[PDB]
RNA sequence: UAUAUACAUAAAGACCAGGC
């Protein structure tokens, strides 16, 4: 009588934004990202291409309680490059990786059929 | 008025309030409800 | 469609003032017990707002003059105490504007025509100006949709 | 500071399966490719269903479980169709629903099993996935019961409900001989070997790497008979993009906004 | 009640293996043998065809409600 | 036009079974 509905882990009502974006003030250069409506496929990806970034000091995520669905990345990078600079130039690059990915598994499928 | 289901030949009958209950070609006593008309609409979940 | 007091207790009867102002007399069990509703209000002749409890003045009608207490309003009647008045044990009644202060959706089976639970069936349990509740027939649960949403079935 | 470039090589290739090694990338990104081949991969599958008459000894909502479950074919169109949520006709239309129609009878005095085969679509394209090897049983009536029932499939991915999973188990498998030491084995010597593994059989192990990080991430996946398994992948990756297109822009908005 | 759909772990489909398990049996298969020709490999849906308790056979020798 | 449909009833006790 008190389940959730199984589609309000991955849809937004009315008033929820998807990222929020507060400043962390224990620390200089440190940001703090709030995503709704995401789990560990998506936060995974980014933290784990943040730390190729040799600008960035620190990455990491955590789900505060799997019930509610939503993720916590806090990003400190190094002087004069803005943790909001690092958190794009991830999504670009795994945007850069995954559509080589696409473009290669592509061939060795044709490659594979008669050949 | 109502159409009962005989629980012993399958005979649907019609029978109505105020009437002893005995389905004719059985004298069987107990009836059943057959089934309501209206929408039922399932998740396939 | 007729309310009244009781003024007069005898062994078989009661003497009822009405809200028309006349004294009838009816059997113990002609007469049924109203609830009284403490908390109305209505308009007194300068449109202020009157309640039980209220002392008015009478400035019109036949007890211009007199001065009483609400006890209980009815539509457009109103029922006084005065204990200077012998008459009826003080009780008498007085149109309000003669005064100065001294559902259909429920039942139905409707189908959620957008938004997320789009597609299921179900029955009102309560209706509202905005959002009623529908019983979903596919799982156990009642949920709150906006009525634009909902789409009577049949 | 930038994406690894990684590659791929498909090794076994049928109609069940797809075998591919993908190397030169994170832990992270192969795996959120793998745990893509589950949920988000969209797929056909029954939804809505409304039972007429149900004379079956399997009560209705038992009859419209099993329904659901039954995989339907979505080789292509789950491309057009659109989620019925977005959908903005009133109940279902042609775009974001196909219709199934079940009317079934036992006449004889044998018992008649209703099978999947007893699905009648409006469209060609998606059937049950069967039809495209015995049928999957819906339920089974002794002469004189009868059900038939309408139902709308709809589309959907595997993290709503289970049953739009377009997959079979997805094997996953990195690192086969252990160099990496994620596994460390009390007796390494009881331990049976890799499909994968370079060793032979005389040593348990490799040697421990110290610089290395797991590369070569070798996946096995097998298709449940709606998406043949190459495609399978294809929609994965492209699905896996679309999530991250959709943050780069939600973000934008957010960074030109709060600034 | 009567074969699921679906191996619970996995995910593939036993619903249609059924009728096609007890044929094997009748044919003097092993279970080993029978569950190997009609290609389960792993022990999740080999558990569902060995595992399973066929009662839609003993409820359909009740009679109907309707004739 | 105004005004109105407002909530109460299913007793209690006995034994029996189970839960932590
Ligand atoms: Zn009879
Ligand atoms: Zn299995």
């Known amino acids: 009588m008190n389940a959730p509905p199984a589609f309000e ?107 | 008025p109502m159409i009962y289901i005989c629980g012993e030949c399958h005979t649907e009958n019609e029978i109505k309030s105020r009437d002893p209950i005995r389905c004719r070609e059985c004298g069987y006593r107990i009836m059943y409800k057959k089934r309501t008309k209206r929408l039922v609409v399932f998740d396939a979940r | 469609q007729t309310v009244g007091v009781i003024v007069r207790l005898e062994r078989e009867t009661f003497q009822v003032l009405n809200m028309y102002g006349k004294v009838v007399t009816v059997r113990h069990q002609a007469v049924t017990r109203k609830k009284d ?46 204990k200077k ?25 409707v189908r959620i025509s957008q938004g997320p639970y789009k597609g299921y069936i179900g029955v009102v349990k309560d209706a509202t100006e905005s959002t009623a509740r529908v019983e979903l027939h596919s799982t156990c649960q009642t949920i709150s949709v906006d009525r634009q949403r909902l789409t009577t079935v049949g | 500071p930038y994406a690894n470039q990684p590659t791929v090589r498909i090794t076994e290739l049928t109609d069940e399966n797809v075998k591919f090694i993908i190397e030169n990338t994170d832990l992270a990104v192969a795996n959120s ?12 599958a029954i939804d809505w269903v409304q039972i007429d008459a149900n004379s079956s000894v399997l009560h209705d909502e038992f009859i419209a479980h099993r329904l659901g ?45 209703v099978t999947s085969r007893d699905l009648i679509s409006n469209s060609p394209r998606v059937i049950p996935v069967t039809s495209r090897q015995d049928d999957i049983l819906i339920v089974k009536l002794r002469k004189g ?59 348990s192990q490799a040697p421990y790497d110290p610089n290395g990080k797991p590369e070569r991430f070798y996946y096995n996946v097998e298709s449940c008979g709606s998406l043949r398994p190459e495609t399978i992948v294809l929609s994965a990756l492209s699905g896996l993009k679309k999530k991250l297109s959709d943050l780069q822009t939600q973000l934008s908005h957010e960074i030109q906004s709060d600034v | 009640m009567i074969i699921p759909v679906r191996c619970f772990t996995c995910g593939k489909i036993v619903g249609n293996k059924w009728e096609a398990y007890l044929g094997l049996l009748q044919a003097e298969y092993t279970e080993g043998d029978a569950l190997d020709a009609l290609g389960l490999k792993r022990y ?24």
């Open chain 5, 44 to 67: 999740c849906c080999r558990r569902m065809l060995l595992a399973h308790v066929d009662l839609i056979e003993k409820l359909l020798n009740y009679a109907p409600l309707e004739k």
């Open chain 4, 145 to 203: 019961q009868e059900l038939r029932l309408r139902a709308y499939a709809k589309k959907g991915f595997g993290k709503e409900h289970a049953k739009w999973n377009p997959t079979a188990g997805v094997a996953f498998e990195y690192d086969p001989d252990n160099a990496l030491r994620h596994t460390v084995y009390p007796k390494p010597e009881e331990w049976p070997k890799s499909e994968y593994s370079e060793l032979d059989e005389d040593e």
């Open chain 3, 85 to 109: 008045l012998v008459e009826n044990g003080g009780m008498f009644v007085c149109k309000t504007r003669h005064l100065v202060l001294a559902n259909e959706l429920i039942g139905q089976t």
């Open chain 1, 9 to 115: 882990s991955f849809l937004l009502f009315e008033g929820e934004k998807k990222i929020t974006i507060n400043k962390d003030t224990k620390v200089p250069n440190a940001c703090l990202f709030t995503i709704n409506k995401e789990d560990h496929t998506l936060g995974n990806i980014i933290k784990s291409q943040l730390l190729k970034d040799p600008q960035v000091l620190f990455a990491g995520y955590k789900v505060p309680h799997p019930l509610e669905h939503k993720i916590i990345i806090r990003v400190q990078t190094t002087p004069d490059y803005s943790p909001q600079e690092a958190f794009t130039n991830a999504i670009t690059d795994l945007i850069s990786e995954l559509s080589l990915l696409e473009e290669r598994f592509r061939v060795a499928i044709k490659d594979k059929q008669e050949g």
């Open chain 4, 69 to 113: 479950l039954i995989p339907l074919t979505s080789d292509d169109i789950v491309d057009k169709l659109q989620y019925s949520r977005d959908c903005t006709c009133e109940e279902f239309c042609p775009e974001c629903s196909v219709e199934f129609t079940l009317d079934v009878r036992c006449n004889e005095d044998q018992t008649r099993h």
């Open chain 4, 33 to 44: 490719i793998r745990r893509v081949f589950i949920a988000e991969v969209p797929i056909i």
């Open chain 3, 37 to 82: 509703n403490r908390f109305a209000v209505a308009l007194d002749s300068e449109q202020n707002n009157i309640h039980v409890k209220d002392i008015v003045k009478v400035i019109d009608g036949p007890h211009s003059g007199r001065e009483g207490e609400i006890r209980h309003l009815f539509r457009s009647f109103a029922f006084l105490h005065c």
